[PDB]
Ligand binder design. Structure first.
Ligand SMILES: Cc1cc2nc3c(=O)[nH]c(=O)nc-3n(C[C@H](O)[C@H](O)[C@H](O)COP(=O)(O)OP(=O)(O)OC[C@H]3O[C@@H](n4cnc5c(N)ncnc54)[C@H](O)[C@@H]3O)c2cc1C
Ligand SMILES: Cc1cc2nc3c(=O)[nH]c(=O)nc-3n(C[C@H](O)[C@H](O)[C@H](O)COP(=O)(O)OP(=O)(O)OC[C@H]3O[C@@H](n4cnc5c(N)ncnc54)[C@H](O)[C@@H]3O)c2cc1C
Ligand SMILES: [Ca+2]
Ligand SMILES: [Ca+2]
Ligand SMILES: [Ca+2]
Lengths: 356, 338
């Protein structure tokens, strides 16, 4: 893809103007804020008012212990970790605003944005650069009954919930047809008595030899051409799925105490859907190995631009790259501004061992 | 570059054989270790015996204050931070070996490698995949007297050492000829009474506007075509530099209480010189966005493949990516083994 360069002909907001605005409060956005705040760039971070359904702090506030974020040899809850992130962001002078960003206009620079409830045309605020760190959510199908048994038998992270006592030596279902499903199904055979994999199609997304290992497994039944149409239970836990074969028409109840969605994630791209290039799955496209979107001056970090790795530690590293690339652009344009005195020009100071 | 795919008929080692060996012990290698151990792949991580002049744990073992690694809002010392990384790697079952890997043979898989002092031909060990996380050294220029005043006036990290009292309101010098020199000199104007920039070339490799701003800063003097030839002091701390002009040959004395190198990020790639695709500066080339090197089965993480960001948090992230991609390759090759 190409990078559009917006004309720098837009008006400056008298309500609030910032050199860099961060949208989103997961590990991606807070790491960007830490770096920009320490660079004295006075970042503004919008953490959301239950934005996209998540409290400030992001997806990690919906899990418990985190054990693969380095620096915590005894583990740390997702809640504590994101309190730590937010405190570090704040400590160095991030302006953290508990508001959802409702709309952005990327047409001209400085970019215009509006917070939820302050959305009249004359209430815009401006940003010379924007870092999009809005995250993602796991895809669900919202089956009849799912509202009842979500997190009471129905899950969207098999490696997170697999060992939970409610699944142990119980029949389990996985919905999915990709490498995600065949991987999560194999893992669930450590705990369930049996794992059914419901595949909408008759064939495979995962490498044709790998799902051959699925079928060969005695604790695994792949139900091809099969979909789930309802989630039933007893008032406390999921106890069965209504399933249907779409080629043979066979339908009936499949008792399971567990249903694990492995159908992907939905990136939180609503703010920019028609304004930055997106990939086939809706993720923000970035110059590979970089935070740069298809719009000059707009950067993206975290899961909103990563469908492959999807970790806190990669989201954090990715937010640092966004901070460093936004600051470099800001430094470049301040250097080219002959009106600003040299002593007033921002220069990054982010390296330790230089590379000249 | 193309990704060469090695034959998988190589001799398996009887001394030790592993599914994945991680070379290096900074934030990159330990994050990869954590993920691979948790994936029950039993990673082997060589943390070095003072490899590259750094204790196990990497570059951070020479800073007392890490403030921008998220999760530590009150800061942490670099050695405490990397001790925590090491404890996490070992908690989930990493086999951590305090040895420098001295030699690697990437020609066939499983790859052969040798640790320092055990480099006889028959002493090889094998790894089905390797994660190169060897980081970077601190490259000190040739400078008589540098031995006496290194870390007593001379320093390779402006943003680390700039604020210590010995430099405060005193003349300071920066050696370098690009953006890093411009960045460090401007930062040091906050603390020095004045900052000279010693530029080896006739033109700052930095953009013309960056070079333009450097020269017109009221607390900065860019000395073009200038090299340091001697560091001088009272026998305890640095007090001046002898400098030479490369175009006129004139020699002078420059009073400075601090000298900061803005060069000397050397990626640690000697192990794989001529075996993986390297850029002009010795950095390992990776399929962008990935950890994949020019040889199938070899992944890279951290500063050894990142000339651009060079942070511990980005090194950790890229170590995770290396691990996920090595786990994936190991997975497809186990599944295909019928
Ligand atoms: C159940 C579960 C368990 C997990 N466990 C682990 C684990 O153990 N280890 C690990 O490494 N990873 C884990 N992850 C993944 C990890 O949480 C994500 O990779 C990471 O949090 C993504 O960070 P992010 O920066 O993309 O933002 P997110 O964490 O996705 O957070 C985005 C935030 O931005 C806010 N936001 C969105 N839109 C707006 C807007 N318009 N205005 C303002 N705010 C907005 C949202 O409200 C949200 O709070 C887990 C994920 C889940 C779902
Ligand atoms: C003085 C200083 C201060 C810094 N402060 C900060 C800071 O505050 N924040 C920040 O984000 N970054 C900071 N950095 C940068 C940060 O330390 C690096 O970006 C990061 O550590 C790179 O990690 P790495 O995984 O590439 O490995 P490195 O940190 O480079 O460590 C690699 C390790 O591998 C070992 N090794 C090398 N070769 C071999 C071999 N053949 N066999 C076995 N072991 C081997 C080495 O001994 C070393 O211990 C600082 C750097 C320096 C020099
Ligand atoms: Ca509001
Ligand atoms: Ca030895
Ligand atoms: Ca003379």
């Amino acid at each position: 893809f190409g990078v559009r360069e917006p004309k720098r002909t837009g008006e400056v907001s008298k309500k609030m103007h910032s050199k860099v605005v961060i949208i989103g409060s997961g590990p991606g956005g807070h790491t960007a804020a830490i770096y920009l705040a320490r660079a004295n760039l006075e970042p503004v971070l919008y953490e959301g008012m239950l934005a996209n359904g998540f409290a400030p702090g992001g997806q990690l506030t919906t899990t418990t212990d985190v054990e693969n974020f380095p620096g915590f040899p005894e583990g740390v809850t997702g809640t504590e970790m994101m309190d730590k992130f937010r405190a570090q962001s704040e400590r160095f002078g991030t302006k953290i605003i508990t508001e959802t960003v409702a709309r952005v206009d990327l047409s001209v620079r400085p970019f215009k944005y509006w917070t939820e409830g302050e959305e009249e045309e004359h209430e815009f605020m401006t940003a010379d650069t924007i870092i999009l760190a809005t995250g993602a959510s796991a895809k669900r199908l919202f089956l009849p009954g799912e509202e009842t048994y979500w997190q009471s038998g129905i899950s969207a992270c098999a490696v997170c919930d697999g060992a939970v006592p409610i699944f142990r030596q119980k029949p389990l279902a996985v919905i999915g047809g990709g490498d995600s499903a065949a991987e999560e199904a194999t893992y669930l055979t450590k705990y369930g008595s049996h794992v059914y994999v419901l595949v909408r199609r008759d064939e495979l997304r995962a490498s044709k030899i790998m799902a051959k290992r699925l079928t060969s497994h005695p604790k695994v039944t792949v139900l091809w051409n099969t979909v789930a149409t309802e989630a039933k239970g007893d008032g406390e836990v999921l106890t069965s799925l209504t399933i249907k074969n779409t080629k043979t028409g066979e339908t009936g109840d499949l008792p399971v105490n567990g249903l694990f969605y492995a159908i992907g994630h939905e990136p939180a791209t609503s703010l920019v859907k028609s304004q930055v290039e997106l990939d086939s799955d809706g993720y923000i496209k970035t110059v590979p190995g970089t935070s740069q979107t298809s719009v000059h001056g707009v950067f993206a970090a975290g899961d909103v631009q990563d469908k492959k790795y999807r970790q806190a530690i990669t989201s954090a590293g990715s937010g640092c790259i966004a901070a460093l690339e936004a600051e470099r652009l800001i430094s470049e344009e301040e250097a080219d501004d002959e009106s600003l005195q040299t002593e007033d020009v921002h220069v990054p100071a982010e390296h330790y061992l230089g590379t000249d």
